[PDB]
Write a protein that binds this ligand. Sequence first.
Ligand code: CLA
Ligand code: CLA
Ligand code: CLA
Ligand code: CLA
Ligand SMILES: CC(C)=CCC/C(C)=C/CC/C(C)=C/CC/C(C)=C/CC/C(C)=C/CC/C(C)=C/CC/C(C)=C/CC/C(C)=C/CC/C(C)=C/CC1=CC(=O)C(C)=C(C)C1=O
Ligand SMILES: CCCCCCCCCCCCCCCC(=O)OC[C@H](CO[C@@H]1O[C@H](CS(=O)(=O)O)[C@@H](O)[C@H](O)[C@H]1O)OC(=O)CCCCCCCCCCCCCCC
Ligand code: HEM
Ligand SMILES: CC1=C(/C=C/C(C)=C/C=C/C(C)=C/C=C/C=C(C)/C=C/C=C(C)/C=C/C2=C(C)CCCC2(C)C)C(C)(C)CCC1
Ligand SMILES: CC1=C(/C=C/C(C)=C/C=C/C(C)=C/C=C/C=C(C)/C=C/C=C(C)/C=C/C2=C(C)CCCC2(C)C)C(C)(C)CCC1
Ligand code: OEX
Lengths: 200, 30, 59, 52, 37, 35, 34, 334, 136, 151, 245, 93
Amino acid sequence: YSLAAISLMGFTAALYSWYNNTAYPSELYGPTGPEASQAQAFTFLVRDQRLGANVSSAQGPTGLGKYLMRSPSGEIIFGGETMRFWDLRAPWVEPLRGPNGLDINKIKNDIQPWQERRAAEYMTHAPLGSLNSVGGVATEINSVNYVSPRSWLCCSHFFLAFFFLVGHWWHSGRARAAAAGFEKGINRANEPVLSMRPID
Amino acid sequence: MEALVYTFLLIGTLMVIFFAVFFRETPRIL
Amino acid sequence: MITLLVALLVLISLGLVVTVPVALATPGEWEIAKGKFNRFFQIWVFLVIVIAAADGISS
Amino acid sequence: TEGTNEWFGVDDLRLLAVLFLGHWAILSLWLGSYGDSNEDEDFFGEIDYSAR
Amino acid sequence: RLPEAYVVFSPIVDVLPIIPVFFLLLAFVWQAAIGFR
Amino acid sequence: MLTLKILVYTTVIFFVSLFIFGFLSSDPSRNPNRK
Amino acid sequence: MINWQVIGQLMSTAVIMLAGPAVIVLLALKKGNL
Amino acid sequence: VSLWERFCAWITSTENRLYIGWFGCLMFPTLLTATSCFIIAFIAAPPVDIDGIREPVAGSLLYGNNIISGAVVPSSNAIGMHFYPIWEAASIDEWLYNGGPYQLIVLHFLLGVSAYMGREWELSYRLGMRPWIFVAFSAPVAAASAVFLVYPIGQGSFSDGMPLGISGTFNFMLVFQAEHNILMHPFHMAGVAGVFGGSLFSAMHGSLVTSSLIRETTENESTNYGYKFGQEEETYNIVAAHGYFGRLIFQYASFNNSRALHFFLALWPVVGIWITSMGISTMAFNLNGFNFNQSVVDSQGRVINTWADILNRANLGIEVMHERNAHNFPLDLA
Amino acid sequence: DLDEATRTVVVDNAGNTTVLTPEQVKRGKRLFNATCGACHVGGITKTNPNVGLDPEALSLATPRRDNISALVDYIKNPTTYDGLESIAEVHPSIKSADIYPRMRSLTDEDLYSIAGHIMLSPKIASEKWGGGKIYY
Amino acid sequence: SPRFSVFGLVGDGTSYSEGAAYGTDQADKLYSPYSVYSPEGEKSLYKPDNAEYLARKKAVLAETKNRLQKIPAYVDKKEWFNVKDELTRYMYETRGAVRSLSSSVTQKEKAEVFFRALEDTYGAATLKKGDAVKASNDKAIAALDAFTATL
Amino acid sequence: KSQINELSYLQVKGTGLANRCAEVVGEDSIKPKPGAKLVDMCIEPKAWAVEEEVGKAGKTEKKFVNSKVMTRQTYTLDAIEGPITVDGGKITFNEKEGIDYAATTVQLPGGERVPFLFTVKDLVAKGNGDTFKPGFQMGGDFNTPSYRTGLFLDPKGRGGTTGYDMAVALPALQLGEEGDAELFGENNKVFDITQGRIEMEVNKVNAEDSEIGGVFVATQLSDTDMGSKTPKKVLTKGIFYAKVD
Amino acid sequence: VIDYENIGYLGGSSIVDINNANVRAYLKMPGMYPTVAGKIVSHGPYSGVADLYKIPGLSSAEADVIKKYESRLTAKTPSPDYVIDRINNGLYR
Ligand code: CLA
Ligand code: CLA
Ligand code: CLA
Ligand code: CLA
Ligand SMILES: CC(C)=CCC/C(C)=C/CC/C(C)=C/CC/C(C)=C/CC/C(C)=C/CC/C(C)=C/CC/C(C)=C/CC/C(C)=C/CC/C(C)=C/CC1=CC(=O)C(C)=C(C)C1=O
Ligand SMILES: CCCCCCCCCCCCCCCC(=O)OC[C@H](CO[C@@H]1O[C@H](CS(=O)(=O)O)[C@@H](O)[C@H](O)[C@H]1O)OC(=O)CCCCCCCCCCCCCCC
Ligand code: HEM
Ligand SMILES: CC1=C(/C=C/C(C)=C/C=C/C(C)=C/C=C/C=C(C)/C=C/C=C(C)/C=C/C2=C(C)CCCC2(C)C)C(C)(C)CCC1
Ligand SMILES: CC1=C(/C=C/C(C)=C/C=C/C(C)=C/C=C/C=C(C)/C=C/C=C(C)/C=C/C2=C(C)CCCC2(C)C)C(C)(C)CCC1
Ligand code: OEX
């Protein structure tokens, strides 16, 4: 019973590490998976707005917003593949949110240099790395020695919570059979299937 | 038109699985 | 002085790591030798307090 | 609205009514066998074979 | 870095987290020394 | 849409409560050794 | 400059992972309740 | 004598043709829901905008696919990990456009195959068996939950789940290699040792039993008619099979215990599939396989390539071409 | 095979040349990978890929950054690519070292070694430094 | 015959791929064996006494009062998101600049009073209490000038 | 609206309020200044119709057929700004910035999916009169850019400014003097810019908030898929809102 | 377009089209990236290179860096699939 309960807690603590940035602040654990890809879309929005792009009207290759698009509920979100992480509520991007999502004039006018720094190290310290702790995507070269603590905490406790669910299946199957009294095998004298109807 | 053949082969395969389960030769002792 | 006392605490702990389970798992030695082992336990516990005193005084 | 934080997805009180009525219906059948069952009847095994 | 009164023991601290792995190995040595009986 | 949601919620709570009260129905005792 | 870090690490590794087998060797010599 | 007790006696009855049990109260409705939706979506379902970029991918037979190319396409990237039932979709055509059927099938399949596992415990309990057949089935269940649920959770979108199709499966494998280097992950290596070893040990154990069968038939009838169902005697000489395999390699490397041998047949693929299921589940959070790119360096400092670097050039070719319109920024952080 | 000839790098704007000692080379790679390598892995810039660390892009900055002294001047005082406004508040520098605590313990010898690694790397890997994933 | 380095003890050691040479490869002392950086003494180029660092903190403190004074213009409207965003957009650098300028023991207790009033402004903005934001915003301003009037 | 600004981001998200326009209260009048500028023009479509030949009772007239949106709640334009130029008699509006395009896909009866870029890009909209009134009518042409950019690759890897320029899976079609000339229209990806026409109509003006709002009707052409299919005419109706300054 | 002439003036010919090139094409001219290159790319169609001096918001310093490379600038017909991709064409080194 405890093995089933501690396996449910282990899956939960793993996704705490991966998703939550309140009890697991990103200044301590690094950015989350959702946080780091929104930090990339924020960085190249700031990069291209300095070059004079009107980033709210900039059409992407597919016809959606290159920088700013709309969520399926209607909020103004970051464009690209990071449209899946539109529920991200990091503390360095919430100063630019109104009720409609990201505020366009606050993006046009009041983006602070600490936000551009915060998105820059979160873009370059994304939770992506190898087992030998090479930072970046699987096609990256060996120069950066980094794997996020969020990726260590989530992967280890997802590993452990699965095997503790296997322990729930082992020990609950055994305790149910040891209580009924056939955990050592089938009695040859009175086998239960033999005293049953023909099964068809 | 070949999707008619693809559907017939898959539905025909599931009909064999139905008859293999519910019209099986029952294993009998003695 | 703190570095001298912690180095003594490490040596006492290393002596107690390899002698306490030997004294407990031979089936008569703990009741004939526990005054000697409680004496080392108290020197161990007193060393922690003297280190905690010297660490807090120096801070 | 699917990303809103509703208890068990209950956004209309129709859904709360069918959750109660569905769960109480099998409860009422189950109370046909395990209602009128004595509370002070214990056992000292790992498993009880009381009655039906 | 450790506090200045304790940086002498910095190589000892480098082996201290590995000691729980040595406890799992110790149960196999003790079972082999008793002959797995 | 929201008529289908009533039907699925009624269906899910039917089968889940069968699962719940079935395993509460003295289920360890349903073994071939005794009872 | 005699690199006392790897000297300190490998000696403290060797003292620690001999202290465990020293308990079992001593209990085998003492014929204790193993 | 009550109505519920007579229903409980039928549900847990071992005299039904298929055992239902209380896990079958979850197994049969969820799996027949997912089977009904899979067959209809595989045959006839409109194209699904999987990458969220309004580029719909055809997956059904009536939109020009075959058995190999056909798939139930995963949900839209615009949905992400959001719950998308039919009643949250304002029309069924909007639900079909956004990859709604994938979420219905996957969630009913994963519930139903966990209830299939508990049904395997349950019949073993009613039959007086030892319980742990369903622990062996937990290894393909963990694998199905890794590629359909856990890897979407870590990547943050059901669009990155494995498509319910043959060619969609190969698309899932190649993109996973480019983004995570699964071949250089030791958990996939233990999984390959699980299935190569498991099919080795299956062919090994199946050979030695068939090699040492006792004469009970003639040359005209089949050899399988030497076994009678329900017989008490052993049907093959296990001393002769042990004496063969003990001379094939050497004597100390062979199981004389048939119970220890069949335990080893259960443990090797199941632990191997458990480990590779925890490779997919840990590459879900981008703890990738080994990166040895530019690790061999000569005296001047120049990079000498290895076989890992040639493997890296094939990873680079998949990742610059996968989801070719979906990316706007130079790092695939999703 | 790291002779004096490959370790000979341009040191200033006038074109004078110096040899990096083997301590400068080893320590310069370590400090660059720790301090600068998260954004400048392989000579590219991750957060602004128009402005790389390859020697052609360093040649076309308006203060020309093809020197040890000009690279060290960028680390003490970073500007835009045309050198017209300071970007010290968004780039790690000695000028904003109160903002970036990674620059707080860095001598001028450390900046010399880091600028040495940026200058030496195209002599070793020519098109790989600042070339991106095409030359991986 | 190849170059050898048993960890640092036998062989070259000061070679480009020796990984367990903790500080034996370089001349200057490191912060720790597990570091690539020298300590925070002199010879470091970062001088915390410098005038451009102090002026950056004072410019944060001056513009903080400008952002803190446009709070009640959001509270005669009801843009509660604008109150919470104003306290975090520019003002994120305020706690870093105030604690850096708080050296004496009366500076620290005069700084936390500004911090407590800043959190009262934020907590009243989530609760949408209109009078409580303004009653905390004047206390945040009046504790801000008391901190800057020291030095 | 003042009501929407009272809410948190967490109260709005998921609800679908963020795809709605603000409603204006009152009938007043605003006279725009020489430096006047619409700032947060929301344009929300509420009806979609695609032109198609239909077989009603016995004949085959052209009808705008009502179609269902399948790209869920991403269709509303917002934060559209641009100066309001006062001519001699009339008042005109030139939109400049903002989210002035939304890719929408509607489905026709029969299963035909019609993607189109609902846009007001480069709208120059002429009004009648000089003040914003509850009978004021503004309207003009806009430019519809192509639904796919030249960076878009097709399923075979062909695009306008990138990609293959041949059907690369059929290499024996590049043979003889004619080559792949039968596949020219699919290999030649053309960026096409078409024209649309919107007719706004103010019916509610709030002078204390300097906010106008009314209805519109717009027609434009759909996606051509880089010049590979003939585009359909898409008629849309709905509500707009703007603030005047 | 299969066969787009003036493809050299985009990024490779060391003579840069003003109407169609990306902002990375001005990285070969020192002094232009980013603030002068940003003003050429963000503003509308130019008949010649002489219309670059009519950009609202230029200086004399930003004009003199233009006159350094007016040997290297040219104006062709603006192709609309290249005009939209002038800030960001999806190319990153
Ligand atoms: C479980 C929680 C947990 C987490 C999240 C971490 C995470 C981390 N550790 Mg820690 N640590 C842990 C437990 C944990 N550790 C334990 C139990 C020990 C004692 C051994 C340590 C001792 C330790 C040291 C000494 C160091 C770390 C370091 C690290 C960091 C780098 C990890 C790395 O590169 O390893 C490499 C990855 C591996 C070795 C993978 C392990 C794979 C295992 C063996 C898989 C086993 C599979 C199993 C056999 C399959 C079948 C089982 C089934 C039948 C049931 C990372 C933050 C390093 C660090 O950076 O510190 C600052 C470091 O130096 N750890
Ligand atoms: C292999 C061994 C191993 C190791 C090394 C770890 C390591 C870790 N686990 Mg994991 N865990 C493991 C196995 C392991 N785990 C297994 C097998 C499971 C079951 C699947 C789990 C389930 C699990 C869960 C559910 C969680 C962890 C968490 C953690 C992390 C923090 C642990 C912690 O804080 O405990 C907590 C310590 C206690 C409960 C002891 C009591 C502490 C008291 C309550 C603290 C009071 C402090 C108080 C506020 C201070 C005030 C003082 C003042 C009054 C003077 C740590 C990395 C946590 C985490 O951070 O997730 C990522 C977490 O939430 N683990
Ligand atoms: C023997 C008892 C004892 C203990 C437990 C301590 C402990 C401490 N003293 Mg010290 N002190 C001692 C004797 C002791 N001292 C003596 C004899 C003197 C001379 C009179 C001093 C003089 C002194 C001074 C002047 C100062 C200290 C300080 C401290 C703290 C050092 C870190 C810190 O900054 O606090 C911050 C607080 C923490 C780090 C919390 C630590 C406790 C956490 C919650 C861990 C506990 C977890 C749990 C109990 C562990 C699990 C146990 C098990 C049941 C599983 C630490 C709590 C400093 C202090 O108190 O700062 C406020 C300090 O300035 N001490
Ligand atoms: C075995 C029965 C079964 C189960 C478990 C499911 C499960 C599901 N169906 Mg399926 N379905 C089924 C049969 C089933 N289905 C059948 C027979 C049909 C044909 C009529 C369908 C037709 C159908 C459709 C068309 C759809 C679904 C969908 C779903 C998903 C969400 C439905 C939902 O929100 O319910 C509501 C669930 C609850 C209210 C939860 C009840 C659980 C209780 C409350 C336990 C909690 C205990 C509590 C924590 C204890 C705390 C106590 C403490 C406080 C003291 C869910 C995976 C949807 C989907 O797939 O989305 C993608 C969907 O669109 N179903
Ligand atoms: C004179 C001069 C000049 C001198 C020169 C010197 C010189 C001559 C040198 C040459 C020396 C030389 C190399 C000779 C050595 C020969 C040698 C070994 C060479 C081969 C090379 C090589 C490395 C071989 C290794 C390969 C090897 C042996 C691998 C096998 C590994 C192994 C232990 C496998 C066991 C696997 C396993 C446990 C399977 C069992 C599981 C299974 C399903 C069994 C089924 C089963 C088993 C039963 O048991 C019974 C009962 C039943 C029912 C049953 O189902
Ligand atoms: C230097 C590093 C040090 C490492 C220290 C150890 C690290 C942890 C290792 C854990 C070892 C645990 C031992 C468990 C023994 C046990 O299994 O007994 C169960 C039975 C009992 O044996 C049977 O035992 C019977 C006697 S009795 O049961 O033991 O009393 C006997 O009758 C029979 O003949 C005999 O076969 O063992 C067998 O049936 C043989 C199978 C042994 C397989 C275990 C090897 C490891 C797993 C294989 C690989 C995993 C598969 C994944 C590959 C993809
Ligand atoms: C201490 C280590 C660093 C060094 C030596 C360094 C060096 C340089 C140099 C020389 C340039 C100019 C290139 C040129 O002119 O062609 C540059 C640009 C740049 N670097 Fe770094 N850098 C360092 C740290 C970082 C870090 C950590 C980041 C990540 C946040 C970063 C991000 C950038 C960016 C964005 C630019 C472009 C600036 C622009 O647009 O002009 N740098 N860097
Ligand atoms: C009395 C009662 C009741 C009721 C009950 C009911 C309602 C029942 C029903 C029943 C039923 C209603 C049943 C059914 C069954 C079914 C089944 C059991 C199925 C099966 C299936 C399978 C076998 C599968 C199939 C297949 C095949 C074969 C092949 C392939 C395809 C497929 C997969 C499809 C209640 C609870 C209220 C209460 C108490 C009393
Ligand atoms: C905290 C501390 C401490 C403590 C610690 C300790 C000391 C612990 C213990 C430790 C231990 C606890 C150890 C152990 C070890 C163990 C080992 C090292 C083992 C291993 C072995 C091996 C591995 C082998 C095995 C085997 C056998 C025997 C036979 C059969 C086969 C095999 C191979 C399995 C001290 C005092 C230092 C002081 C400082 C601090
Ligand atoms: O969805 Mn399926 O594959 Ca995961 O990376 Mn990002 O997102 Mn999409 O791209 Mn690559």
